[PDB]
Each structure stands twice: as structure tokens, then as C-alpha cells.
């Protein structure tokens, strides 16, 4: 795709859907990329942390 200067170009790239049967994002806490740190609760009930985890 030749994109000239200061001109947006919409790209279409298809994706196969991810299937929940073999990923289990529901219970997979977000990685701590610098572990060995004091644990502090951000504060989020189950219904919100599950949402944020799925989105991430």
C-alpha cells in the first residue's frame, strides 16, 4: 500500500477469532514485569477486574 504524505490509508487485515475454550483468560492475572515489589491492592471487585483482565 503506497501511502503518500499526510494521507491516512485504511488497511484491512483479517483475523481468526480467539476461542475461550482453550485460552482461559478469565483466571490469568496480569503479569508483574518487575516482580519482588510490595503488594498493594488497586481495589476492584470481581465484576470489574474480570472485565479489565479480559480487555488486557
Amino acid at each position: 500500500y503506497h501511502v503518500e504524505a499526510s494521507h491516512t490509508s485504511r488497511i484491512i487485515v483479517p483475523i481468526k477469532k480467539i476461542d475461550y475454550k482453550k485460552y482461559n483468560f478469565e483466571n490469568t492475572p496480569i503479569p508483574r514485569i518487575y516482580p519482588g515489589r510490595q503488594f498493594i491492592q488497586s481495589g476492584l471487585n470481581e465484576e470489574q477486574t474480570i472485565e479489565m483482565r479480559q480487555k488486557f
Binding site: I40, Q41, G43
Partner: protein, 193 residues
């Protein structure tokens, strides 16, 4: 019984519901008029420890004003040579009031008073809502001693309290000297006639 050389007044002050009533049971003696927390404003405790070969009596006043004790709690800091600010590391509301309590002490309590900081219920790491780093950083600015205490992690509050007493005694003690062949025989009068 009245052998203690010095009598220091200490106030165990903190937010309501923090758990002071369970806290002092370790480094205090549990007899005499128990309770009376709401009768006037306070409950009383005593401890005896020797520092530099000198007995010291420490009286702990765990005041708590709910809605009625506005001027009385203020009057109860008349001569407190020590204070023992307490907060719980479960809810940041208790920590947020520490500056307010310290302001009340340094405004109303005895001049140049030594004050410490205690973090109670540290065993409950499930709902920890305040880090030790921030606690120490806040302690540094106001030259306060800081530690964390719990039922399982006992015997640390005792050391902290003894260390606070030692800090007080090295600052409100005037140095003294240990003040403890006389003639014998029949004298003769020599005053003039």
C-alpha cells in the same frame, strides 16, 4: 511501691476502630479499673522499666474522642512527654488522619515531645492498603520512629515502646552525681566567757 524515680506521661492516640484496645494489651498490665474508655475519655495503663540503673514508670493514656470529648481530649494532652500515633494498614483513611493527629499533638501536647508511629494488623496482608515505603517516608519528615505490629508478629511493639522510653529519658533527664572519717571523742568547751 513508690520506688520509680521518674513518671512519664504517654498518650496512645489514633483513629477510632484502628484497634488500640487490643494493641496496648501486650505492652501493658491488665488489672485494676479496666474499661472506663467512654466514662471520661481515657483508659489507663502502667509499665515499669529500668534505664541507666534508674527505675522509670510510664503511664499510658489511650484517649479517644467520639463526639462529646472536644475540649476534654485537648486538655488530656496537658503534659504528655510521649505519644504513640497508631494507624491500621487496611484503609488509607486511618493513615490520612495521622497528620491531623500529629498537628494536634505538636500544637497542644508538651513542647519538643517525642512521638512514634505504629502500623497495626500487619498480619492481614490480604487487604494491605498502605505501603511501608510511604510510612517510612512520612516518618522521616517529622523525625518519628516507625514500625509495624501484629498478633503473630508480637514482641516488636514492646521493643519499640522501650526504645521510645529510652529516647525520652535521654532528653528530659537532668544529669546528677551519685551523692552518698568523722571525728570521735569527748569534746571540751571553748566558747569565750
Amino acid at each position: 511501691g513508690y520506688d520509680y524515680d521518674y513518671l512519664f506521661k504517654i498518650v496512645l492516640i489514633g483513629d477510632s476502630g484502628v484497634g488500640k484496645s487490643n494493641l496496648l494489651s501486650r505492652f501493658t498490665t491488665d488489672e485494676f479499673n479496666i474499661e472506663s474508655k467512654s466514662t471520661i475519655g481515657v483508659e489507663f495503663a502502667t509499665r515499669t522499666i529500668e534505664v541507666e540503673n534508674k527505675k522509670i514508670k510510664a503511664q499510658i493514656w489511650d484517649t479517644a474522642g467520639q463526639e462529646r470529648y472536644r475540649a476534654i481530649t485537648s486538655a488530656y494532652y496537658r503534659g504528655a512527654v510521649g505519644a504513640l500515633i497508631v494507624y491500621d494498614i487496611s484503609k488509607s483513611s486511618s493513615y490520612e488522619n495521622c497528620n491531623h493527629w500529629l498537628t494536634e499533638l505538636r500544637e497542644n501536647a508538651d513542647d519538643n515531645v517525642a512521638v512514634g508511629l505504629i502500623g497495626n494488623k500487619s498480619d492481614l496482608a490480604h487487604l494491605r492498603a498502605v505501603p511501608t515505603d510511604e510510612a517510612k517516608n512520612f516518618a522521616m519528615e517529622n523525625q518519628m520512629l516507625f514500625t509495624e505490629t501484629s498478633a503473630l508478629n508480637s514482641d516488636n511493639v514492646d521493643k519499640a515502646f522501650r526504645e521510645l522510653i529510652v529516647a525520652i529519658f535521654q532528653m528530659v533527664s537532668k544529669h546528677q552525681v551519685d551523692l552518698s572519717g568523722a571525728p570521735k571523742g569527748p569534746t571540751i568547751s571553748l566558747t569565750p566567757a
